[PDB]
Structure 1
Amino acid sequence: SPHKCPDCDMAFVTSGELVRHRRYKHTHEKPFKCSMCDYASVEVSKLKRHIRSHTGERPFQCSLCSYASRDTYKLKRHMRTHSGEKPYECYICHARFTQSGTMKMHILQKHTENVAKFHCPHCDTVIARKSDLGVHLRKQHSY
């Protein structure tokens, strides 16, 4: 911990990533700003990734189908559809999932007590997931 942060218990080996840390967490200085919206980042790379949402530029092409992503890590995640990998394991029932959010959702829906459920206003049926309420609304009533 050579360059200790004067505001918290964290410390960094180079002064550069201390400046970036003090930006992300303490000073929130975002000098790299998008010229098409109010988005700004502590990092230029985050800015450029953001820019590709405006242009539709998908530079990272999947080699097994027509899919292509705006961020390298989204491609990596998409490849799990062709590979069937399931990197995340629930530490309670040990079921496996292709994404971390899916696991968190599983832990919330299967292993958390007294979870607030969603209710359909039109047929008085309890639904566990916000998105399943949306589908229920679209398929059943009128939506």
Structure 2
Amino acid sequence: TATHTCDYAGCGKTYTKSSHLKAHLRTHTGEKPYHCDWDGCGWKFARSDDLTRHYRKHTGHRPFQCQKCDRAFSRSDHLALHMKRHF
């Protein structure tokens, strides 16, 4: 019934979900179980979604398509910042 708060002296951040805290706790430890298998990259991550996002950098996966223009991006926030140039 407790709210997920970090119990490391210095921290104290509280999160809404336990999974949020589990990701944060991996910052105190060095745990990054999600590795990038790309040739020569070596990047590792503590959250799965970050590896997915990072991986598009290697695959060229650009799902977010600018409809005024013909430039695409691998991330939603990348495109949103591009539309400002199309105001």
TM-score where L is the length of structure 2: 0.82
Match of 1:95 in 2: 71
> Which protein has the larger Cα radius of gyration, Structure 1 or Structure 2?
1
Match of 1:32 in 2: 4
Question: Which runs of no fewer than 5 residues in structure 1 stay unpaired?
Answer: 1-29, 113-143
Letter paired with 1:111: H
TM superposition score normalised by structure 1: 0.53
Task: Give the drift of 1:49.
Answer: 0.5
- Find the counterpart in structure 1 of residue 47 from structure 2: 71
SS in 1 for 2:24: helix
Q: In structure 1, how many angstroms separate the alpha carbons of the residues matched to 2:33 and 2:54?
A: 14
1:86 and 2:86 aligned: no
Paired-residue identity, %:
33
Post-superposition CA distance 1:9-33 (Å, at most 9, x none): xxxxxxxxxxxxxxxxxxxxx7111
Gaps of 5+ in 2: none
Give how far 1:111 is off: 1.3
Q: SS of the residue aligned with 1:79?
A: helix
SS in 2 for 1:35: coil
